[PDB]
Nucleic acid binder design. Structure first.
Ligand SMILES: [Zn+2]
Length: 253
DNA sequence: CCACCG
DNA sequence: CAGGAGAAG
């Protein structure tokens, strides 16, 4: 689950419980139990996302930080319901009609307002690809900036200090869209390619967010052994940056 | 380069 | 049941 999927989840958490008084609050972790009574009768004011970090803001200036990594997932249920699952329950935020449940995530903590800028992940993250205020022109500047112009794309497009919310499927899909392998740096692109990359870094995540739940589809991710829809070569699966990697040898260079 | 499910 | 599927030491 990458930025698009986390923002879709956050939207569903807001539809379920934004603004509604909490009738019960439960945390599995011993260090979070102290906040249960403190949050009963408060409400979620909004669910913010910064890339894959999810920030559940409450009406008393606390914010729950959660990060699902590769395995966490939120579920929305009617209050009192809890469908059988083998997953470990980590957070329950309950209101009169709907409850939200966080399963499996291990990175969960309660933040005071000052920590929204000093928490180690929140301090390092770059601009979010789903932020409508972030433009292709600003992404082009970021690519060409001294800080990032010499970085290889293979790792750059996984690094949340560059653009928050990109993960491996988005890396693979963006590089195929612009015809590039991961072994390039922004300093070496021509202006047309840089512009194409800047646009794709925003437009593919935004299209996935809008339509994965003309609709988003994978062009190469998990399509090894299939013909590329652009040039017909057979898509390959390898590893890149210690993660799987999908690409087309006929049209990515 | 710690942390559910062929 | 070792190893595959976001991020930091
Ligand atoms: Zn191709």
């Amino acid at each position: 689950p990458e930025g698009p999927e986390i923002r879709r989840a956050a939207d569903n958490l807001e539809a379920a419980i934004k603004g509604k008084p909490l009738t019960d609050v439960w945390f599995a972790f011993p260090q979070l139990k102290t906040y249960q009574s403190q949050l009963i009768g408060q409400h979620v004011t909004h669910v913010e996302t910064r890339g894959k970090a999810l920030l559940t803001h409450f009406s008393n200036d606390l914010t729950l930080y959660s990060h699902n990594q590769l395995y966490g997932v939120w579920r929305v249920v009617d209050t009192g319901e809890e469908p059988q699952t083998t997953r470990v329950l980590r957070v329950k935020l309950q209101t009169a009609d709907k409850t939200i449940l966080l399963y499996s995530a291990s990175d969960i903590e309660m933040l005071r307002p000052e920590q929204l800028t000093t928490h180690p992940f929140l301090q390092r993250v770059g601009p979010d690809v789903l932020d409508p205020n972030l433009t292709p022109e600003v992404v082009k500047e970021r690519l060409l900036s001294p800080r990032f112009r010499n970085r290889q794309f293979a790792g750059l497009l996984l690094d949340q200090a560059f653009l928050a919310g990109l993960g491996n499927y988005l890396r693979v899909e963006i590089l195929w869209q612009v015809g590039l392998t991961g072994n390039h740096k922004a300093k070496d692109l021509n202006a047309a390619q840089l512009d194409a990359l800047a646009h794709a870094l925003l437009e593919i995540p935004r299209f996935s967010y809008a339509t994965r739940g003309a609709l988003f589809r994978f062009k190469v991710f998990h399509r090894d052994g299939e013909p590329c829809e652009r040039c017909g070569s057979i898509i390959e699966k390898t590893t890149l940056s210690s993660r799987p990697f999908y690409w087309c040898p006929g049209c990515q260079h």
